[PDB]
A paper describes a structure:
Superoxide dismutases (SODs) are important enzymes in defence against oxidative stress. However, in 1996 a Plasmodium falciparum iron-dependent SOD (PfFeSOD) was identified in parasites isolated from infected blood cells. Malaria parasites are particularly prone to oxidative damage in the intra-erythrocytic stage of their lifecycle. The fact that it is an FeSOD and distinct from human tetrameric Mn and Cu/ZnSODs raises the possibility of its exploitation as an anti-malarial drug target and indeed inhibitors of PfFeSOD have been identified.
The crystal structure of PfFeSOD has been solved and refined against data extending to 2.5 Å spacing. The refined model consists of two polypeptide chains, A and B, which are related by a non-crystallographic two-fold axis of symmetry, together with two iron ions and 140 solvent water molecules. The overall structure is similar to those of previously solved iron superoxide dismutases, consisting of an amino terminal α-helical domain linked to a carboxy terminal α/β domain. Since the calculated molecular weight of the monomer is 23,799 Da, this indicates that PfFeSOD is a dimer, consistent with previously characterised FeSODs, which are either dimers or tetramers. The metal ion in both subunits of the enzyme is five-coordinate. The coordination geometry is trigonal bipyramidal, with His73, His161 and Asp157 providing the equatorial ligands and with His26 and the hydroxide or water oxygen atom forming the axial ligands. Trp122 forms a hydrogen bond to Gln69, which in turn forms a hydrogen bond with the hydroxyl group of Tyr34. Tyr34 is also hydrogen bonded via a water molecule to His30, which is bonded to Tyr134 from the other subunit. This classical hydrogen-bonding network in superoxide dismutases may allow communication between the two metal sites. There is an interesting pair of adjacent charge-charge interactions between the carboxylates of the Asp140 residues and the side chain imidazoles of His139.
Numbering used by the authors:
A (entry chain B), B (entry chain A): 1 to 197
Amino acid sequence: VITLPKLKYALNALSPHISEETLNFHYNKHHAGYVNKLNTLIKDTPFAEKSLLDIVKESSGAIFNNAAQIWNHTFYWDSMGPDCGGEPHGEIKEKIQEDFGSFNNFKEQFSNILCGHFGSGWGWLALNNNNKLVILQTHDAGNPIKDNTGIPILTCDIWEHAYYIDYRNDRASYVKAWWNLVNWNFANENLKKAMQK
Amino acid sequence: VITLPKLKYALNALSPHISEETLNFHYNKHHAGYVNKLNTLIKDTPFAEKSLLDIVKESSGAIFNNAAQIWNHTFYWDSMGPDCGGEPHGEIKEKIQEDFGSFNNFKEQFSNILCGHFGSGWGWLALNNNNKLVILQTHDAGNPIKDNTGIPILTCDIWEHAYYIDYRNDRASYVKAWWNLVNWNFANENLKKAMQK
Ligand SMILES: [Fe+3]
Ligand SMILES: [Fe+3]
């Protein structure tokens, strides 16, 4: 029953910023891996009929690890696109200006958070409870939904598997390149959703 | 200032099990990077003149993260060598037999926890305080000394950088290959010292 959601673009679509190779390993291997392990762990428990998010919300241990990673990855693929990147636009542009001063303030702060996360984890743009954009970081499979720290708008995966093929130990160049990939229309979809609450 | 202790072998001495390319990034980028970064963090601080192990035992935060990783990597490199691997011999052969039934019991339990570790971390063979060999796992920069959980005898790095170049997402092949590299002498020397107390 839990299926690996489809990419909205081709395996080559993020090149040269993230490679076709990477997306093959990250999506066809790692991401699919979390779906298959989750389906195994929940087959005959209370979790089998519950939704991905409910699982994420109520689970712990190995089930949460795989559940959250599935959700995190889907959010990550949708956080990017071909023909995306550069300056923001629409509502998210106006809110990033309001809540961080300027786009440039946000980008640098986000990049620094992304680059200094120790070990495996994620960076997030999130809407907190003051109806305010906020930069978070989570470790491993952690998630702002689980933490109740904010409603996700964008995410960027900082596990070594997300860049190691293309960038080796050079996380900073992966981060730089990711800005060419950021999908502002997903961000806008999420901000409108998130404001409704 | 703390230094990057030389390898006991050549860059390509662990191939084909761990390639020369991996060792180059793992040792010359990752491991050195931890050295340069710790030197800068302790520069003008109470720790500027303490030994690696004292910093490991006494600190937290980014300082702990870098010190612990220099230590954990040197132990990792010393845990391996060319013309090693295979069955254990001497004191470690015997104590493993006693504490786990047989070598194959240990190798399978140790492969399982090495493969099972979620996110970044380390597998350990250690002497616990009941004078018993046990398998420990630590997350991120953690080691058993800091944790007072045991005396390390052998370690194996599970961060994706340790294997991603050679094995991609296939952690289990890296662990299978690692068995061809296990330095039982280093193990023996550690058990002797450890058993002395
Ligand atoms: Fe990932
Ligand atoms: Fe490492």
